[PDB]
Design a protein around this ligand. Structure first.
Ligand SMILES: CO[C@H]1O[C@H](C)[C@@H](N[C@H]2C=C(CO)[C@@H](O)[C@H](O)[C@H]2O)[C@H](O)[C@H]1O
Length: 537
């Protein structure tokens, strides 16, 4: 039967999955068409990046209406059909909860801008007087995650500059005041609304956000690279009461709803508090995602994930915010900055390592989140033309930080077609341009090739379901620091040879016959940069 503990979740970046309407934008009609492909791959659930009404200044994470689907993606009726079709295929459905902030076009925030200092409208956000004799300094020294100030100054109704409002992310994403009672009430209503439509749970955006220190103190570390975690801006005690309330709400349903947090905090003990039994079910294990190709760093990150997750963490190797794994591992090897390195990526090296890494991560106890396109071995499109970039990171850095658009390129479905089957002929230009070579990675081509990245993922998910029991914990076979990672789970032994020479496992690891491998191999040595799953006799 289905279990969240062992779920393999396909992350659907809807804008770039499949364009059924022919407007150049991935949409719900396209997702409906592609659900058969997700289930055939072997996945257990889908998580949709936010598809609510949004001006797309942060591509869905700036929400203007939490109770409606963006008209570019479809109607609520089409959404209901997607949910029922997914369910009919056995796929559970996670939506994306974005409650730290809303779009500046949300009706509440437009009302706040039009209201006076001290109004209730502004009290639902974080508006403060500026510092300096004319208020020209921001109220404190906080940085936007996307670069620049975390505050924007507004014009008051006398036409002169006045108060500033806080935005942890883009200027167009004002942060709520989570101490204002209307905010919590609104988000309980949002949860209930979507749960009523059969949504099975939420991925929680900025789960370390929502509450800040009520005094909004300056970060003593400053703005610089090694300023450190801004303790006043994130990860406050009140956020745990919030998740207790959401968990209690979700636990009233049968089956109970599911919550996975997107949490970025440095301390594993701080992270673990989000996963206490009355709070969130899980959180992405980002330590592994940011590691370079290195056996020792992988092992340490896996150890951290297993402790924080109490034995069944939520693993992921890529998402819509970081460089694709084929690029990360194909580059020369040296928090989130580690997953956004620039420089030449060797495609064959990156594909080899990405295959081995997928095979390793899918053997770990717990759940696994596959970002769309990773099952095709897509590289990051680093050479996107300047003019095509849309990520606020690009604009706010004046072009000195590339941003995330290179992992959001519309997927290739067929070798043929001007958009590689992402849309039909008659369709508008795609919202981000696909490179001329994307057709080489087409899903249909890979499905027909037993050696493809897609076929490897299909084999892994099939073998994971038949041979890997969720109740069997890791028994480490290799020692700390080894260049070859090896463990046993029940009667399956997993070996990842991170190095460039073949490796012969010591006979004490058992009498092994191979189940699958991320490369060819009929010997008992593990080829370079290869993962092998074997049955233990
Ligand atoms: C290092 O992580 C930081 O930067 C990341 C980009 C953020 N990720 C989420 C936060 C926002 C803001 O809604 C969207 O722009 C991202 O796509 C979403 O996945 C993290 O919450 C934030 O802590």
């Amino acid at each position: 039967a289905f279990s969240w503990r062992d779920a393999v979740v396909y992350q659907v970046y809807l804008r770039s999955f499949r364009d059924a309407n022919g407007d150049g934008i991935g949409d719900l009609g396209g997702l409906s068409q592609g659900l058969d492909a997700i289930a055939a791959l072997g996945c257990d659930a889908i998580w949709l990046n936010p598809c609510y009404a949004s001006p797309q200044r942060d591509h869905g994470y700036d929400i203007a209406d939490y109770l409606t689907i963006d008209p570019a993606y479809g109607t609520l009726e089409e959404f209901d059909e997607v949910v029922r079709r997914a369910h009919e295929l056995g796929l559970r459905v996670l939506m994306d909860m974005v409650a730290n902030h809303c779009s500046s076009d949300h009706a509440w925030f437009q009302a706040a801008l039009a209201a006076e200092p001290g109004s209730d409208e502004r009290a639902r956000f974080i508006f403060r007087d500026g510092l300096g004799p004319d208020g020209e300094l921001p109220p404190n020294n906080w940085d936007s995650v996307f670069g620049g100030l975390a505050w924007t100054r507004v014009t008051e109704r006398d036409g002169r500059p006045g108060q500033w409002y806080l935005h942890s992310f883009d200027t167009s994403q004002p942060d709520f005041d989570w101490r204002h009672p209307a905010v919590a009430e609104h988000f309980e209503n949002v949860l209930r609304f979507w749960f009523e439509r059969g949504v099975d749970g939420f991925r929680i955006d900025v789960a370390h956000g929502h509450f800040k220190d009520a005094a909004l103190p300056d970060h003593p570390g400053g703005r610089g690279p090694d300023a450190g975690h801004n303790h006043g801006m994130w990860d406050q005690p009140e956020v745990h009461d919030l998740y207790r309330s959401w968990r209690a709400l979700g636990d009233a349903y049968e089956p109970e709803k599911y919550f996975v947090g997107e949490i970025w905090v440095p301390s594993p003990d701080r992270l673990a508090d989000y996963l206490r039994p009355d709070e969130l079910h899980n959180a992405f294990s980002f330590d592994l995602l940011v590691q370079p190709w290195n056996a020792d760093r992988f092992r340490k990150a896996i150890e951290t994930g297993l402790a924080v997750g109490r034995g069944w963490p939520a693993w992921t190797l890529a998402n819509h915010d970081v460089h694709r794994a084929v690029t990360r591992y194909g580059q020369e090897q040296p928090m989130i900055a580690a997953a956004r390195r620039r420089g030449p990526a060797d495609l064959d090296r990156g594909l080899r390592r990405a295959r081995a890494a997928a095979a390793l991560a899918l053997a770990l106890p717990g759940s696994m989140y596959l970002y769309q396109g990773e099952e095709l071995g897509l590289p990051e499109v680093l050479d996107l033309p300047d003019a095509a970039r849309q990520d606020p990171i690009w604009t706010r850095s004046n072009g000195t930080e590339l941003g995330r658009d290179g992992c959001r390129i519309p997927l290739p479905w067929t070798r043929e077609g001007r958009t590689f089957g992402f849309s039909d002929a008659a369709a508008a230009t795609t919202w981000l341009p696909q490179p001329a070579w994307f057709g080489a990675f087409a899903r249909a081509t890979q499905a027909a090739d037993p050696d493809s990245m897609l076929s490897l993922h299909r084999d892994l998910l099939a073998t994971r379901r038949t041979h890997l029991r969720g109740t069997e914990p890791i028994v480490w076979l290799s020692p700390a620091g080894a260049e070859v990672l090896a463990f046993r789970r029940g009667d399956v032994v997993v070996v990842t040879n991170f190095g460039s020479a073949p490796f012969t496992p010591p006979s004490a690891w058992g009498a092994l016959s191979p189940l699958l491998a991320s490369q060819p191999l009929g010997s008992a040595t593990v080829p370079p940069e290869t993962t092998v799953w074997s049955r233990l006799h």
